[PDB]
Amino acid sequence: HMSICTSEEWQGLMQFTLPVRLCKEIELFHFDIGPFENMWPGIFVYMVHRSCGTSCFELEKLCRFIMSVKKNYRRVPYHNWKHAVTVAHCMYAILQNNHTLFTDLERKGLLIACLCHDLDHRGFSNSYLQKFDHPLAALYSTSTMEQHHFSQTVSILQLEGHNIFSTLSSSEYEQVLEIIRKAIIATDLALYFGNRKQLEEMYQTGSLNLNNQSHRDRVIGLMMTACDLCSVTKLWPVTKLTANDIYAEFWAEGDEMKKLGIQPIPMMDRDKKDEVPQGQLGFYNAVAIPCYTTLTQILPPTEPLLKACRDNLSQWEKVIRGEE
Template identity: 40%
Template structure:
């Protein structure tokens, strides 16, 4: 008899293999032992791989069930899509969608959905990509449903970003530069670019070591937004890309991913130098893929920050929402991380809001809009309104600084007065606790 243990990759015994009686009747020798040991190792590897395969199959099955469940709860019901389908869609002129000054602040939820539908209709995307009208309704509803009720990065922000892209294409001179598939993907990306936003930024996800931060080391939330976008597009009843051929579909997914990741300001800072150089040197060759990619990324940033290009009364109202969400993150940093948040996230530094807005405009917004105006001067309204709002914020920053200086001056004067009174009291013997002077 010849016995050998069968071990797994960790060296633990999984079983035993046994040989009984050689055919020629001779005894087992060292050579037989070595060969049988090799066979036992092979058996161990086979058993281990089989078990691993079974685990993988179970995991895949669980994942499919989870995705099916998630998809069911994440997508809008068909009844709701049928309701929206029956509603009349106002024209772009009635809604004011062609204007860069457009605001959704006074619109109802249904009105934003119908306005989104109008943009896709006016761009003729349903016809060009053979999209069923009810499918489009359901996709829009599902996208809205997958935005959380956070203070700023919600469905209304996404809708505003899409409207700015629509205005850039229709009124900003980009219609003849972008292809149909690029227009389609940019519009889808704008509506999807902040899906399932939690009201906190990438840095916060890293600090709390969230599962999302463990999945993605860069552009954490943007990768998640893209994943959510693909999940909805692949959900039953929401397949607005279903009639694309394989090559078109692959290209569309690539364009979508790039567009959504481009909304990460870290990506913007990495790519904008090259774009600025191309525009400044008048070396724009939009038939080259690399330059087209830079242009699409810059357009996504311009739309994402477009709140700064709205009329002043709208800009002030949106700024309150933006900083409200920032302060909420700062509160979480204090509570969960016992950390003093950065000024932008610190509600105790709210007096610095105008000054921070000026810094944001100077560092990010103005350079972006200046470069796009050089690409096509029809986008100049974005730059003009941004500059106007920058001046308004600077005026408020100046007033705030003066008020803070006055407070400090008053505080300093009060302290000096207290010191002088104390010194006077001491010199006359009338300070608190001083002994009475003898006659």
């Protein structure tokens, strides 16, 4: 049940050279991949090499993994192949600015987990699949699609020559799958709120501590929500265009509810276009600013994410004022 990538796809990826004017701009947080669609797989290659190293993964295997991941993502409006790399790039930019704070096995896990973090997303949220007794929701009582994303991640590895972790020992093999599993479940927004409050509680008292493993996982969890929502940290017109992709997936999910007879939540109602700016304003205050505030407190050189989020909050505030 996994789409195997062709030789022509991953061969052309090995041969790919990164343009020198992108080598500079890849490092910056605000960097928008959007314009360079044909270059995306090779930009993930570059990001792995710059963080982990050239001999980190066997280049032939890594290129099969990437192009088979791309093939397993569906063509929904938002949770798609484009999303995977934008989130994986945010992680890269964080990891670069806090490098020896994490291990090489963590670096391997989090980028790979970011690129696979929404594998085979059907366009539909957890609550929709749970409320209409979907086979996936029966399989996973809490965090439905996130567990499916982790399952699809592990299925890709088990294909012929796709297992990038063959050269690791089985000690570090089950560690990297546990880092990846933990990181992919953290992306379920439901758990972020508890995760943030806890880390805020741990920060202010002074009891937070990086080699305390339980704290380390919460810190990695926050990074995976900061990355998963990183479209709010981009430039203003990029962010406006991305939210239009996000709502297009919400409104299709809301169309499916109106057919069955039950009217959806206003966020997934396409008649409620008027509420969007006020709905964003809420999202930035109760989720986004909070996410990047406690991120900047743990890791000071992830402040640009918080800075550009303040900037985009101002723009969303101005849209309610009637300026735009």
